[PDB]
Amino acid sequence: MKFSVIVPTYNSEKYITELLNSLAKQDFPKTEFEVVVVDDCSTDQTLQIVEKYRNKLNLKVSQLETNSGGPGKPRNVALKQAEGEFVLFVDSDDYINKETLKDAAAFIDEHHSDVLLIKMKGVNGRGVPQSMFKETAPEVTLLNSRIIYTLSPTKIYRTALLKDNDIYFPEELKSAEDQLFTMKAYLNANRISVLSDKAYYYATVSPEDFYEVMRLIAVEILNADLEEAHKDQILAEFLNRHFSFSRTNGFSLKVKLEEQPQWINALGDFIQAVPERVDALVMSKLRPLLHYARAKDIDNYRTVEESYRQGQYYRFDIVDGKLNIQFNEGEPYFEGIDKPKVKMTAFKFDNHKIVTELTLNEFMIGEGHYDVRLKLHSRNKKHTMYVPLSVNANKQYRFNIMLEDIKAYLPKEKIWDVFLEVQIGTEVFEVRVGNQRNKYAYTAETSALIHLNNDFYRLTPYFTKDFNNISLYFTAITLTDSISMKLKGKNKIILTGLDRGYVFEEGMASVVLKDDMIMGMLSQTSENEVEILLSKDIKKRDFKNIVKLNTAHMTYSL
Amino acid sequence: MKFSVIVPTYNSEKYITELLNSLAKQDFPKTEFEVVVVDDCSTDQTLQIVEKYRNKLNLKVSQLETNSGGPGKPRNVALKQAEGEFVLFVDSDDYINKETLKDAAAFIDEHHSDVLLIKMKGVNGRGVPQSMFKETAPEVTLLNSRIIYTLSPTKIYRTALLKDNDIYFPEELKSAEDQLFTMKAYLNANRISVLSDKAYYYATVSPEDFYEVMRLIAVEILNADLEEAHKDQILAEFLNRHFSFSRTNGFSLKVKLEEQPQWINALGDFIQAVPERVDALVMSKLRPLLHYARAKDIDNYRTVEESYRQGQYYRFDIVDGKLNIQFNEGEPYFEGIDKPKVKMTAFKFDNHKIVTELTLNEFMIGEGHYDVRLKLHSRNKKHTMYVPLSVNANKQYRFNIMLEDIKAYLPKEKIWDVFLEVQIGTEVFEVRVGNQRNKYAYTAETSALIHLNNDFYRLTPYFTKDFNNISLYFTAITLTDSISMKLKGKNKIILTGLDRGYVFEEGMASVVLKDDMIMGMLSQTSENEVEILLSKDIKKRDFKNIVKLNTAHMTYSL
Amino acid sequence: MKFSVIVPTYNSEKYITELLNSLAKQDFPKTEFEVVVVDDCSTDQTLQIVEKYRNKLNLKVSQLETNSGGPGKPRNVALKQAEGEFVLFVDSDDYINKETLKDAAAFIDEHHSDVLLIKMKGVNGRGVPQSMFKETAPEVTLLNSRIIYTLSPTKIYRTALLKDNDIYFPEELKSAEDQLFTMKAYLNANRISVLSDKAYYYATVSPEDFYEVMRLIAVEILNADLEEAHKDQILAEFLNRHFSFSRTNGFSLKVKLEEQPQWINALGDFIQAVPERVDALVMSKLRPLLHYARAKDIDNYRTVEESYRQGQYYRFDIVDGKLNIQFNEGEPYFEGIDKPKVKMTAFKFDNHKIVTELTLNEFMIGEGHYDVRLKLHSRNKKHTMYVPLSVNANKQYRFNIMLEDIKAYLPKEKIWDVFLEVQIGTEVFEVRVGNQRNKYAYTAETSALIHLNNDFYRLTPYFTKDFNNISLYFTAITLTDSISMKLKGKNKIILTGLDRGYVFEEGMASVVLKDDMIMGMLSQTSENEVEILLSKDIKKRDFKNIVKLNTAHMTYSL
């Protein structure tokens, strides 16, 4: 055979039908795949609905003598019963696509994959991460990709890869038992593949056993058949993920103060299993958690997290976007802790204002103790412009760049670079924003009209070619050469942007003649067109005498 | 017996029945507690009411020869008559819970407590503090707990603890004679417990006798059988409560000038008893007061309290959130002295922006030496929002909360608390506003329409129930279920608020059809109706086809 | 003979007749003055023209054997020949007022001056100090007048003062030689006077010599027959002028680098004769320059001058308006080193907002390290308003003052003066603005209409009489007494300011009736006339029934 579907079931009567159908609707030969469903001793008509697919699917039903309490053992007993060339672990609450086994079998015969990663899609609001399923790579490792950011068994593994190297689910450890199964596959797979052509997989205690599994992963990486420099970098990105997205992230804040001695000890043996040379590779804000984990000093560990949330430190000084923190009278100085990273999460504008939203992802300092201002620096480093913070929420700072405020300053230069100024007392940081951002919500070269001294200019936001950073292009134009004015119907004025697009502020509008004016409603139909739904009909001979044209906050005389 | 309820009555004919019912409704054996009632020579029929409880309770009735002037003497006369193992001082105007004695004996039998503190709860608006009854603790001392913040005799004392140490209420001092009693019992107790499982207690002249009690407390603190360091600390926290809550707090600003020399002499002999070494442990703002109390200088004492009210000082400078104040010409320099009083004098809001005016009534620093920001904190303390200062005048700080800038940050949570950040260099003060304010010029549950991603929400400014503090409530609504759109006449659209009133910005407003628009005005008729006086008339069949409806600066899709 | 006029000439043939005529034209008896011309070995016909006057004047004519290169040796030769009671030096290209000797003679006989300054006047673009010639003064000193700011020898000196004290021009020092001569006269003079009734005097290389003269002056001052504190004070004034206006100012920025060591060595020897106690007496900015001059250290000296000129300092803070500056690593801090100049480069306003731009023309600290706010201060100093910065471009600071934000605070006072507050940490500058400005863009008394609690007010910018600064006058008005409203045609409403112009924001506007509304476009046709071009006709009977008039952002109930 080719595949072998393993399904851990436990009290899944109300939704096993959604999975047994996906396996039946499979666009794949029935003789080249099987479904091994081992039950964890259910108390409902679960096997009785599975047996409704014995004729539609090659089936191997098994049931444990007693309940195990997790998908660990049901997947292991089914792993010994699997006779196919590959395995696919699917929980009973999930389902797959109709062409999942078809596209996977072809992808195997072309790249000869040992571990295959299919892109997942979340239903009913389930994540399911995405940082590794943006492209289709026939070969990845734990450094050049993000496969280390997903460790669930919802992937495709080679049966010989897991049986020869002895890779089974730890039955005794019911806490995150899956993270060891995948990491053992990642370190022992000669080639790891990521498939991302469509949506394939559709998903729906004492900290002792948890921190033991983490220690097992740190040991498997150090003892794998890889280069020593690569072993700690793989272990570093694993600590980059554990201390940021697992339950360890801030346990001294949430876990009861009575049970924190139980946490710091179990976590202590995990970090003690990681060499102290790896601390230079993990994220700099995690090193104070790595030192206080080995020493098992919970009091000094609870303070490091409390010093991060509220941004209060006992003693500190800054050396270029990186601080040197002393969390207590006598504790050592952690140096090289982190210029703050800036990502432009939003960018909207028109002929009235410019609304940007810069978000500070990695800023160790707490919010409120530092002041930020948006800097608009010229290319020749002569003129600049500072726009204050309009409103902020957490580390999302929104600036409202009103054009009327900066109209009399743009004609100084044609290239206005957009920096973000960060200041803490007397230390001013100059971060160039642009290279990290979301998808630009406009078409390229989309400018906005600016009237100034009976002349017309266009403020063109664009990204530089060097480092993809955003700037503002301010140059003089001619109206009749950029935007055409036509009369659609008898109560609509269409402004069509010829060479480029021109966005404008939607809402109320007003056109003016020598002796009459008509009110209208402006609305952006497309990126290079604008409709003005007027109140009364304007005759075409009156359309030739449009003296002035205003918006809801800006005016333009013809 | 296990308990001896001591009841000092005097003309309690109108409310002793509630107490005598609560003492009979106890879920406690009758032979374990006695009610020792000592009347202070009443003028009415108070005793005739007590006598009718002799068949339900083991009653002890007595009456002094003349009125003593308070519960002072009647509490000691009942103490010699009390033969139960423990005493319980309950005023003639208050009453206790059904399970008071029952939950007290079981708790004493489980920890052998010498002073038990039952949780007090006030009726008809009576404080009754709350800081020390947040938890049920088996053992607490005068430095790791707030038990010093409650010196009322309404507690459970061990008959041996009071008698074997000559702990009796002083008779010759009528002012605060009950604080020396509890402090004598606090220091001499080997174990102090606090029972806060439920609500147990329901509570309803020359200063020569006042500060004389305070003097006996300071000497009692210095002559206790504790460590010398623990003596000065218990003496300090006593000064931290006396000078903050008793009559000393600002007496020079209230007492007549002809009687302030009398006050500065009595308060002096109490402060002269406190060694000058203990002042280093008192709160820094009281050290100037403790100095002029020993010197008994009332002209310089009044100078300090007036300086603390208005923020004026003869010569000062700020050194890291702490000021060094000299109150007069030729006086020593008090250094290292360290929240402002806020009253929301105005609050206006609509579907466009929010206007609130927060005023600083009392601050220990002049304007221009600190920054202020408006904080909108979430209930779970996960999210936050800061609005920059729009304008200020002296100490009246006004903020403009533009809804367009904050619409992207509200749906993160549903409850937002309104704080007030005040940063002096780096030390921040987060003041909860709303309780002190002017009259709320709106009706309760008055919300405001908000539009975001074709959804309809409501911003409901409300006041919390625990502390009357203002907050904002964000949740979803159905437009056709909270607001109705009707046609008054032919040129008026009457917006009606059903379940709650909605405020909107008055001014220009337009309705848009598919191929026709209409200009109009917007005037808030009443608090739950809005008039849209249009420019032209509109037929009833066209009123059904209103696709979009805007205000002065906001749009809304129908 | 009252006067001896001493004239050094050198190739003066083209201009010598002007002086000789002015001496011949003196309204003074010829017997009572002589003219002593000593020619510095001219190669033209200077002497022959001079001889033409030997009958009109008592003339002594001499000529040196070789050109001395300067007036020093010629004047000394003449002074040895002078028999006048007084001498007057006039340069060969200068000339004197016809009434000079007559007026000076009378002044001398009334006051017995030993040194007599006579007011100078520059022709053809020359100056010529004036600041010490604003008044006539019979007796001045170096410390209570500005005489130390003019050291040329174009003055009247008592011959016996010079000869008895051996006061001659240094011949071997060719630079600034007249400064030593005049300093010596001042210090020996019993009375120094200034005669300013009219314009009397009409005026048309290595640094070893320059700084050698300066060192002799220091020695001369310190050795004078004056009080010790006075010697130090006089010397401080000489240093103030010398570093500010002599060739010493900025020498490390102008002189070739290879020669700056030579400058600092001659300058160093000069400053080394000045006791260090005197540095405390000099303008604070000069103190670092004095320090490094004494040490003859050009590298640190050049850094100081460059730091001043570019506003960059290695490390500094500001305490109460003065800077503490460390100019280089390891160097001493110089403390208490000394307001920015402000020009109002824009001012626009309407009934909706005020827009003003302030430009810092000169400021000892670069952009970004200070904060600025606009301050409105009531004339009685009781109330204050602060407006945050809206945007800034380099040192151009723009403030948008939204009148809706300040409407509630304006009624407290009538006069609001505009200040710019500049805060650097905790040192605050209050700079009154208006006296430096671009041309005010409105007719005087042009006002804005404000509506507040059913009452109408005008906000009127104006300029003060005493210092021409800008203030805001806020007072109540009666609308129908101040502004007329009339109908022009059928679709235009004209608002005319009757007593003053009223400026309104241009753009959309509306008039509201009790059952109707009409939109329009507002345009400012003149500075006291506003036109609202309505979207339709209005009957005369309904124009009288306008209840409400709205602009783009404001409403006015009529």
Author numbering:
A (entry chain B), B (entry chain C), C (entry chain A): 1 to 204, 216 to 349, 352 to 571
Study authors write:
In this article we describe the crystal structure of TarS, an enzyme responsible for the glycosylation of wall teichoic acid polymers of the S. aureus cell wall, a process that has been shown to be specifically responsible for methicillin resistance in MRSA. TarS possesses a catalytic domain with a canonical GTA fold (one of two distinct A/B folds characteristic of nucleotide-sugar dependent glycosyltransferases) consisting of two closely associated α/β/α sandwich Rossmann motifs that abut and form a continuous central β-sheet. TarS possesses a D(91)XDD motif with aspartates coordinating a metal cation, a feature that is typical of the GTA superfamily. Altogether, TarS features a novel architecture with closely-associated trimerization domains connected by a linker region to three protruding catalytic domains that face away from each other.
